């Protein structure tokens with residue numbers, strides 16, 4: 101007997117197009133999403149060229165409309181030069197992404213004053229998300245308070261960070277956060293097996309105590325999101341390993357395993373992969389869209405999942421219980437039992453739907 | 463210039479049918495909802511007969527399908543006799559309502575053990591809401607913890623209650639709450655004008671300090687809901703005044719006024735009247751549904767709003783800014799400028815929609 105879930109939303113994916121299409125492209129990354137029970141993705145802007153201006157967003161929108169198999173929204177990226185220039189296109193994006201730690205030269209911000217400038221100029225009704233680790237979480241929260249608005253913290257990975265966010269929420273501050281599956285299901289204990297190249301990710305894998313703190317503080321976690329960050333095995337195993345794990349195809353099976361073990365409820369999962377993504381990012385419903393999962397099927401994660409061009413996975417060897425059997429997207433069968441059945445270009449930019457515009461005062 | 467909002471949801475209304483139809487019926491109460499920018503309502507079970515068993519729910523479902531002009535879900539009510547008997551119909555209801563303070567003899571629970579029995583027997587994946595004032599909030603929270611599940615607290619009205627809920631949330635407990643507009647916009651200062659009969663409501667109007675505490679603790683409030691509780695003026699002004707205020711037609715104008723004054727943002731409002739109701743009660747999206755509001759129009763609330771059969775309002779004389787201009791429900795114009803344009807029976811039971819069933823493990 102299958103369980104029907106609504107269309108799940110991953111608010112943090114790197115689909116690598118334009119400019120890194122050997123790692124992933126819209127077509128392969130959204131095939132991976134559908135196979136993971138995800139029907140809508142928000143794609144990050146650290147592409148080549150990065151999505152830091154209107155022409156780059158226009159290009160990315162067309163590449164996504166032509167290649168995506170599930171629905172999507174595209175983030176804009178903050179740069180040292182673009183504060184105050186994005187107002188005409190801001191509402192067409194998923195939100196604004198700030199990279200506040202290590203990143204591409206083009207997305208590097210060298211001063212907290214540049215963070216303030218973005219918080220002051222980006223339209224106040226639209227989402228801002230930040231890659232902000234350790235004390236950077238507290239720093240960006242301060243900027244958000246100085247500018248009197250909300251912030252969403254990407255991939256919280258540490259006891260330190262979740263407790264800081266917990267304390268901020270206890271003070272009524274408008275902050276939300278997400279956690280990625282690798283920070284719930286992998287730790288330092290796995291670095292021996294992964295090795296130093298494959299194991300490179302940012303935020304880095306935490307201690308057992310970090311992992312346990314995230315689980316204990318599930319109530320503080322608003323969303324799950326994969327931070328699907330595909331790189332090829334050659335890259336991960338080479339001399340300058342880029343950080344990141346692929347994760348679209350493994351996220352939901354890992355979390356369904358946890359549900360089956362009573363570590364969180366089905367509702368807890370659906371708040372974090374459906375309702376809270378919708379409400380934080382003002383993402384629209386998808387009509388006639390659902391995911392059918394089999395919660396009894398036990399399997400072992402293989403050395404690579406079928407669809408991501410990353411062609412490797414750090415979860416290899418983990419035993420999971422739960423599998424995606426069928427996905428229906430806007431009335432069409434999109435995935436059954438290992439076969440994607442919608443072509444590149446079936447997916448649409450949800451920010452162009454009437455119901456996908458973020459409401460604002462006139 | 464109008465602002466387009468999504469279809470708003472009121473999770474706490476009393477529509478009086480069956481058995482109190484001089485006060486309101488499905489057709490008049492849902493006309494009032496549409497005129498208030500509400501496209502989906504959850505109707506409480508304290509009707510005559512009360513919705514405490516499968517035959518009463520079946521009757522109410524047909525009366526609602528024939529009379530409702532907007533979409534709806536119907537609550538079941540807990541009684542001293544029905545724990546363990548509702549499992550076959552539970553999933554068809556909005557949730558289970560517990561009346562833990564004053565109420566009808568049929569909904570009266572005389573022992574906390576009866577509360578426990580309901581929390582133990584009602585399906586664990588389905589909503590439970592409680593009318594729980596003052597220390598009763600803490601008592602029902604204890605029952606929820608003993609039975610390891612969530613609870614939603616209706617119409618929080620006091621500093622004491624919002625601070626208790628705040629403390630529970632800080633401990634990661636699964637509790638949500640709603641606040642009604644009369645507890646944000648009226649206080650003891652208004653009892654002279656209202657008089658002792660009109661002013662009767664449960665929870666009673668709070669002090670200025672209660673009202674200020676609710677505003678200061680907006681972050682703790684998950685939903686707004688009217689507790690639309692229509693009674694005629696003859697009843698409110700008579701010898702045994704029943705408690706309650708009509709509120710569907712005034713809720714959104716009062717809250718839009720507050721948005722225009724910067725007391726909360728448009729997003730804060732939409733989280734509380736759309737996203738959080740959806741996610742707490744697992745209510746489905748409504749396709750091609752939206753509300754157009756005019757935020758500049760200043761008007762004074764009259765002695766009665768056009769649609770509720772209550773034919774009075776405690777907000778008479780308050781100056782508001784914001785008005786509902788047009789409502790579209792599932793592709794049809796449902797309301798324009800004082801005229802309801804969908805007939806009784808246009809509305810549907812959202813729990814019968816495939817997307818409106820609450821997900822559960824097999």
Ligand SMILES: O=C1C[C@@H](C(=O)O)NC(=O)N1
Nearest residue numbers: 114301302303329343344
């Ligand atoms: O911050 C980031 C970005 C990402 C990428 O590869 O794009 N991979 C990571 O591990 N962390």
Ligand SMILES: O=C1C[C@@H](C(=O)O)NC(=O)N1
Nearest residue numbers: 476663664665691705706
């Ligand atoms: O608890 C309740 C119920 C309600 C009603 O009239 O049905 N009116 C109130 O004022 N409080």
Ligand SMILES: [Zn+2]
Nearest residue numbers: 231254255302
């Ligand atoms: Zn990141």
Ligand SMILES: [Zn+2]
Nearest residue numbers: 112229254255
């Ligand atoms: Zn993120």
Ligand SMILES: [Zn+2]
Nearest residue numbers: 112114144327
């Ligand atoms: Zn990322």
Ligand SMILES: [Zn+2]
Nearest residue numbers: 379382383732
């Ligand atoms: Zn929204």
Ligand SMILES: [Zn+2]
Nearest residue numbers: 593616617664
């Ligand atoms: Zn009540």
Ligand SMILES: [Zn+2]
Nearest residue numbers: 474591616617
């Ligand atoms: Zn309620």
Ligand SMILES: [Zn+2]
Nearest residue numbers: 474476506689
């Ligand atoms: Zn009520």
Ligand SMILES: [Zn+2]
Nearest residue numbers: 370741744745
């Ligand atoms: Zn739901």
